[PDB]
Amino acid sequence: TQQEKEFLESYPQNCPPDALPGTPGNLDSAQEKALAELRKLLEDAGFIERLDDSTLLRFLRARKFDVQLAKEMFENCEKWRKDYGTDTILQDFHYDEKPLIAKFYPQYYHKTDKDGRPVYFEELGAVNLHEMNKVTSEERMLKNLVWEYESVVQYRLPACSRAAGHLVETSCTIMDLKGISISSAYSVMSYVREASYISQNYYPERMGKFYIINAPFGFSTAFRLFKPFLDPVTVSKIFILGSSYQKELLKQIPAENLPVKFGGKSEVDESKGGLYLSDIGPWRDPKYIGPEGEAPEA
Numbered sequence: 001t002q003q004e005k006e007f008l009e010s011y012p013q014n015c016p017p018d019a020l021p022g023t024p025g026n027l028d029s030a031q032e033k034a035l036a037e038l039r040k041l042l043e044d045a046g047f048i049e050r051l052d053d054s055t056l057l058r059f060l061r062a063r064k065f066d067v068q069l070a071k072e073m074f075e076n077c078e079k080w081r082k083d084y085g086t087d088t089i090l091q092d093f094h095y096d097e098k099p100l101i102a103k104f105y106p107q108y109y110h111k112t113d114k115d116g117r118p119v120y121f122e123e124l125g126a127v128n129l130h131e132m133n134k135v136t137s138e139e140r141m142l143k144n145l146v147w148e149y150e151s152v153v154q155y156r157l158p159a160c161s162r163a164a165g166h167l168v169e170t171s172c173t174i175m176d177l178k179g180i181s182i183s184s185a186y187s188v189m190s191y192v193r194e195a196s197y198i199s200q201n202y203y204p205e206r207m208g209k210f211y212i213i214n215a216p217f218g219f220s221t222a223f224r225l226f227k228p229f230l231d232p233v234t235v236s237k238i239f240i241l242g243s244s245y246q247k248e249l250l251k252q253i254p255a256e257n258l259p260v261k262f263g264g265k266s267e268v269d270e271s272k273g274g275l276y277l278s279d280i281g282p283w284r285d286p287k288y289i290g291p292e293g294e295a296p297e298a
């Protein structure tokens, strides 16, 4: 379809050459063969959508380029999108509760990192589900999560790719644990479990960086101790920081892109809902919005 063709050639499709192997534009002979094989296998099953290089390579990387297991993971995902209504969630779901409950679990995207990734912030430590459940449900919070993911894929990543000069398939997540207790950790645990399950199985290879900040001492000490036994890919992606996280964040995010409260210089109009209701980034800049148009407002 022209439509889909126009969209694909409307932003850069190659990852930088120093990215991980098996990423778009960085494929060896074997990898290119696995991609072509997986594609025809999915075409033979009648799939017509989501068969672009970027998508299929993510499923291949998630299965170490085992073509057969990538096919099964892909087919599992399309079945979930069917049962959950994912393909129309942007039109069907309406998180009208958000101004009322945002402060009880702040979640927001704000600008980009030095690699061009959209930066996602989650103030898990402030979570108050007792107040949240007066207004909304875990089921609706997960719908809102998938809504945002669909908005990342459809509108934030293509804009971030154009603004960066190269393909951007991943986000940079900052999770603030300030205020977390054993009690509230248990209360958010079911939500976090379902969110990771959805991320790993239906959005594979979308995690580029994951910073935990204000981590309690026991949690941070454990990571510092087991850090040497981690996959070198993993140790470049996951950071568990305590109270002094600002300098580490500033190595990864330009100071003018990082919110003031986290050691940066980026400001929002605190009178108009400030950070918690904001969605600022290149996907709100006409310079970087392509034929998909501008992302909806939550």
Ligand SMILES: O=C(c1ccc(Cl)c([N+](=O)[O-])c1)N1CCN(c2ccccc2F)CC1
Binding pocket: 120, 122, 148, 149, 150, 152, 153, 169, 170, 171, 173, 175, 192, 193, 195, 196, 199, 200, 203, 206, 207, 210
């Ligand atoms: O894998 C992801 C992930 C999943 C989907 C999308 Cl579309 C993106 N993205 O590019 O914005 C990232 N994440 C890592 C785990 N994540 C997470 C998981 C559980 C609790 C909180 C969290 F922030 C969310 C982000």
